[PDB]
Amino acid sequence: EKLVNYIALGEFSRETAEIALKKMPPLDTLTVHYDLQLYKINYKTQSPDGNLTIASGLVAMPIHPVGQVGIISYQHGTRFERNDVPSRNNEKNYIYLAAYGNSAGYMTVMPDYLGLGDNELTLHPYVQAETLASSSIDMLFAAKELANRLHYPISDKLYLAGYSEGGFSTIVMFEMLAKEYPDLPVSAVAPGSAPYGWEETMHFVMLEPGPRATAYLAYFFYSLQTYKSYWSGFDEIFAPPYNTLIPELMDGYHAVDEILQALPQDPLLIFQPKFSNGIISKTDRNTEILKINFNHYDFKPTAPLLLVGTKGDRDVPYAGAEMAYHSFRKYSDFVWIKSVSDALDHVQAHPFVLKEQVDFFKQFERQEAMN
Ligand SMILES: [Cl-]
Incomplete structure (x- = not known):
């Protein structure tokens, strides 16, 4: 039951x-x-x-x-x-x-x-x-x-x-x-x-970002790292101060318009360059498991x-x-x-x-x- x-x-x-x-x-x-x-x-x-x-x-x-x-x-x-x-x-x-x-x-x-x-x-x-x-x-x-x-x-x-x-x-x-x-x-x-x-x-959301792209990516990688720890920590993924802001924004009690206003429109600005590039280039060390999740x-x-x-x-x-x-x-x-x-x-x-x-x-x- x-x-x-x-x-x-x-x-x-x-x-x-x-x-x-x-x-x-x-x-x-x-x-x-x-x-x-x-x-x-x-x-x-x-x-x-x-x-x-x-x-x-x-x-x-x-x-x-x-x-x-x-x-x-x-x-x-x-x-x-x-x-x-x-x-x-x-x-x-x-x-x-x-x-x-x-x-x-x-x-x-x-x-x-x-x-x-x-x-x-x-x-x-x-x-x-x-x-x-x-x-x-x-x-x-x-x-x-x-x-x-x-x-x-x-x-x-x-x-x-x-x-x-x-x-x-x-x-x-x-x-x-x-x-x-x-x-x-x-x-x-x-x-x-x-x-x-x-x-x-990934290409579309990271490099042709629409009005919600940064929010989607912040949510996705914050949640994936939280549950699966595929990366060393949040600071490998997120550039400051987004490494600490994103967890706050994603607490379940921020209105979506407030989230969108707090984050830049260009998602690359929330990530460490090494990390975002690795995702895009499929050279991230987790690319195979990421494909299994997504595809x-x-x-x-x-x-x-x-x-x-x-x-x-x-x-x-x-x-x-x-x-x-x-x-x-x-x-x-x-x-x-x-x-x-x-x-x-x-x-x-x-x-x-x-x-x-x-x-x-x-x-x-x-x-x-x-x-
Ligand atoms: Cl793919």
Whole structure:
């Protein structure tokens, strides 16, 4: 049993959902059909060190479903604040509930991730494949336990989506489900604007830095060194005073705009030159283990797969999505790639990408369907 405890958080109405959708075109074109009941859950999963840890997330259940209810597991993007995660259901979370739950009618399952929400680990293991995958799978299983306890019948339809860091989480979750849980059917998978490829992503974020690049890299290397100690210490990685500022900024209680204002726009300024150059040149002594963590685009998909993003992305390289697409196509014809724009950026494109995800899942909902 993974489910440890839960708390009812009240309802999320059609009317509240409609207001949220209207704020984020093109999602305003979705029709709302349901009110949802919300639960915050806590569940058992493994830490980066392979110990038991109790993590949190949100489950949202359409009330009075007209059809049999499929599950969508939605993996959120980068969060620097402990409490800005789905189990808190703040207004920024509403669009996910509105689109997937109130409109699409899916039981919507949203992990917080380790180091966030109620989890006692002090720091999120950021873009770390092993635990993003296991924490998301264990959340799904715990959510299914909740539905069983509440006599909420669900179908066997299962959809996996996410954005940004969560696009990566979605891909690694998919891989691990296929490997470790081969008898659990997955219906469709649609990672949104994910980072693909260690070299591709490092080059883009370090040398073509968009507005959040320094923050992403600070989070990534601070978290990786914290959990894995691949380098001698933080001062090998980070130039002063960022070696001590970054740990403060990443405490879970700094607003993301404050983090972005405290860090330079050019990520090279936060690193020792030796270190950053070694990463870029793949001459860092840890390059092989870094590639193992990052590179998850060479496995056989066991469900229809849509890689959806924006060619306008300045946060993660669209070239990485193109590379991943060709890699996955070696294994399956049921693989597609879609750009929602030539110029919308990572943030602007988000509601367009969400709309594509919902539409993709609906395509696979309405075939191969049996009670
Ligand atoms: Cl690589």
